[PDB]
Ligand binder design. Structure first.
Ligand SMILES: [Ca+2]
Lengths: 262, 165
């Protein structure tokens, strides 16, 4: 709806930075609204949904198991590792690592999962194979959050992330069981002040947020009323010098407009 | 009563019970169960895509178990960070904690994790230090020059760094 676009422009003014926005119909895959759909933005932790999508594809292929326990050590720990640091002596299963990466944005969990699929280069190969020739992961956590202006490493475009997310959640890419598992992880708790803060009772939402350096912030989500998703929304911004509160606020307001004019 | 803070973290001692930990940290800031098992995880202010926090581990799941592990990210600030890549490269495995600090700077590090696998005995204690360069520490964003140094029984077992110059 045009009012949402007004809010997106206001956000660019407030933040003094670019905002990329896409609303995609889940069923048809048609773009409902877009703003800077083809500009690149750092993915930050939103890439963890694609990571686990790639892990699930291997599970579907019988080359990986959800219950496989991964042992790691101090050498593997990186900044922002609340769950993995707690489990250091016991190890964690693939299933627990995806849960940690997606629901808690645990950075070491993402690195360990990245190792199981062969690294950034292989995640990028996976995306390429499913038709996404735009999204690219080049580095590991925590360096991928650097967000140096004009650097294309670890970036996606709003339209590419939206289309790729659609393929993962509704496509034949993953088996039905895996699609549900991916959604379950996203439906589960650090993105409260973003889109969730404006969601009416009964609505469904499966989201993944991200934060990075240089005022980078973003969120990808599948949401819809009466407990079922019907639209994918992707919102990214980078470059602002406004505070995190301010950044969160602007995204939440775009979200409020999106719901109001649903 | 305020979020979890570095001051509260310092007040909590090894050997305290779950209730003592909760009374100091503020129950509203903490959670247990789920992804944390029987540990108590307490959140401070928002930071990055999560929060600054402390996690306290216990000898058992019992209501009267004792703290045998303390971990935190972004609650404690280094007092005088002087770490540089040059100093980091001079640190060697086998150094005592004292030698390490004389090399990277007395105020460049904070304690990331400290665990007593044989509590109440101190034998086998594992300690991870997070160290920072002059502008590397950030309690709300991402570090810009940091290192992880870990020890067992007071002797350095390994080290890793990010973005040191
Ligand atoms: Ca630095």
């Amino acid at each position: 709806h045009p009012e949402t676009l007004v809010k997106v422009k206001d956000a660019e003014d407030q933040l003094g930075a670019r905002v990329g926005y896409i609303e995609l119909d889940l069923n048809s895959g048609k773009i409902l609204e877009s703003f800077r759909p083809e500009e690149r933005f750092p993915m930050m932790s939103t890439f963890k949904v694609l990571l686990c999508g790639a892990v699930l594809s291997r599970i579907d292929a019988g080359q990986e198991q959800l219950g496989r326990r991964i042992h790691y050590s101090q050498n593997d720990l990186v900044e922002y590792s609340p769950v993995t640091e707690k489990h250091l002596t016991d190890g964690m299963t693939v299933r627990e690592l995806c849960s940690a990466a997606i629901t808690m944005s645990d950075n070491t969990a993402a690195n360990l999962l990245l190792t199981t699929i062969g690294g950034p280069k292989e995640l990028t190969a996976f995306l390429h194979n499913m038709g996404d020739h735009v999204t690219r992961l080049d580095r590991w956590e925590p360096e991928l959050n650097e967000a140096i202006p004009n650097d294309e490493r670890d970036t996606t475009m709003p339209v590419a992330m939206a289309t790729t997310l659609r393929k993962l959640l509704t496509g034949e890419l993953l088996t039905l069981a895996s699609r549900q598992q991916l959604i379950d992880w996203m439906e589960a708790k650090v993105a409260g002040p973003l889109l969730r803060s404006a969601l009416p009772a009964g609505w469904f939402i499966a989201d993944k947020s991200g934060a990075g350096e240089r005022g980078s912030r973003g969120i990808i989500a599948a949401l819809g009323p009466d407990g079922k998703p019907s639209r994918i929304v992707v919102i990214y911004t980078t470059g602002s010098q406004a505070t995190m509160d301010e950044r969160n606020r602007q995204i939440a307001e775009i979200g409020a407009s999106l719901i109001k004019h649903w | 009563a305020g979020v979890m803070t570095g001051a509260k973290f310092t007040q909590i001692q090894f050997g305290m019970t779950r209730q003592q930990v909760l009374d100091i940290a503020g129950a509203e800031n903490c959670e247990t169960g789920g992804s944390f098992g029987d540990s108590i995880h307490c959140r401070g202010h928002a930071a990055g895509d999560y929060y600054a926090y402390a996690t306290f581990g216990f000898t058992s799941a019992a209501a009267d178990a004792k703290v045998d592990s303390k971990s935190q990210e972004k609650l404690l600030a280094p007092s005088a960070p002087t770490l540089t890549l040059a100093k980091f490269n001079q640190v060697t495995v086998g150094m005592t904690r004292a030698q390490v600090l004389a090399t990277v700077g007395q105020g460049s590090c904070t304690t990331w994790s400290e665990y007593y696998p044989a509590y109440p005995s101190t034998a086998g204690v594992t300690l991870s230090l997070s160290c920072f360069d002059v502008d590397g520490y950030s309690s709300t964003g991402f570090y810009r020059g940091s290192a992880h140094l870990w020890f067992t029984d007071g002797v350095l077992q390994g080290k890793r760094q990010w973005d040191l110059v």
